[PDB]
């Protein structure tokens, strides 16, 4: 059962990026953390001991997001250079450069099969790409302002997208056509979305200090999580599932917030960063959180809980 609270404590601080960190993600096999930054670099770190492993270079401008393939062997990154790059993590080599967006690429993810990448851009489109060939399969005219997040569900058949236009939409992967507009407001911006692990729910952030858990099928809000600060940045949120069932997010008051998913109560706030916590990630098997901060800080912190 979910305990009353976790007890995340700081274990490591990872320095090396020279501008704001933009995203952190654990590999599915649990071995690694990948980070991206405005400094144009991807860094790989040991997930359990924080040990710096390597830098992956090649983008010409800053990177906003990085994501792992299901087998932990590839990464995709989204850059202000208007491209995505697919990387072989072991060799550090760029396998493909995905060209087609006409402005910054902000968000990216692989499908579970890891044969497709989805991307979202400041150009207001969502693109779907073939991993093996690097070909753009589809361009969806998804939004009327920059796309803040894109994510596939557990069987790969759906993509959820969000935007500063205020919308959250769900797309059929195979045809590219819209299944549903889940959130149909013109304000506030929807700054982050993702499916829950079982695919039944969508976690959505809006730039009014609010996270919400939605039932995809019914199109209804089930839970709202508040108390943090989020009016400007596209801050990631996570489902923590290895121990207690939490929602995790960074915040513009430099804290990591952790809520009980069911009761909506704040159960812990992690203090230590000295700038906005833009990204958090939850380890796939251990009760470990990674957090990363903007340019007054530029570090990643690894935190561990007993539950
Ligand atoms: O300007 C922002 O909002 C900003 C910079 C970096 C991030 C975090 N992020 C990246 C992709 N999805 C979320 O957000």
Curated annotation (Swiss-Prot):
Site residues, Important for interaction with histone H3: 80, 106, 236, 295
BP-aspect Gene Ontology terms: gluconeogenesis; negative regulation of transcription by RNA polymerase II; positive regulation of DNA-templated transcription; positive regulation of gluconeogenesis; regulation of cell cycle; regulation of cell division; regulation of DNA-templated transcription; regulation of embryonic development
Effect on the protein of changing residue 213 to K: Loss of interaction with RBBP5 and reduced ability to stimulate KMT2A methyltransferase activity in association with RBBP5 and ASH2L
Location of this chain's protein in the cell: Nucleus
Modified residues (N6-acetyllysine): 85
Cross-link Glycyl lysine isopeptide (Lys-Gly) (interchain with G-Cter in SUMO2) mapped to chain: 19
Residue stretches of each WD repeat: 16-55, 58-99, 101-141, 142-181, 185-226, 229-269, 272-306
UniProt keyword annotations, A-Z: Acetylation, Chromatin regulator, Host-virus interaction, Isopeptide bond, Nucleus, Repeat, Transcription, Transcription regulation, Ubl conjugation, WD repeat
Listed Pfam families: Beta-prop_WDR5
Keyword Acetylation attached: yes
GO cellular component, one term: ATAC complex
Quaternary structure, from the entry: Interacts with PAXBP1; the interaction is direct and links a WDR5-containing histone methyltransferase complex to PAX7 and PAX3. Interacts with HCFC1. Component of the ATAC complex, a complex with histone acetyltransferase activity on histones H3 and H4. Component of the SET1 complex, at least composed of the catalytic subunit (SETD1A or SETD1B), WDR5, WDR82, RBBP5, ASH2L/ASH2, CXXC1/CFP1, HCFC1 and DPY30. Core component of several methyltransferase-containing complexes including MLL1/MLL, MLL2/3 (also named ASCOM complex) and MLL4/WBP7.
UniProt-recorded name of the protein: WD repeat-containing protein 5
Species per Swiss-Prot/TrEMBL record: Homo sapiens (Human)
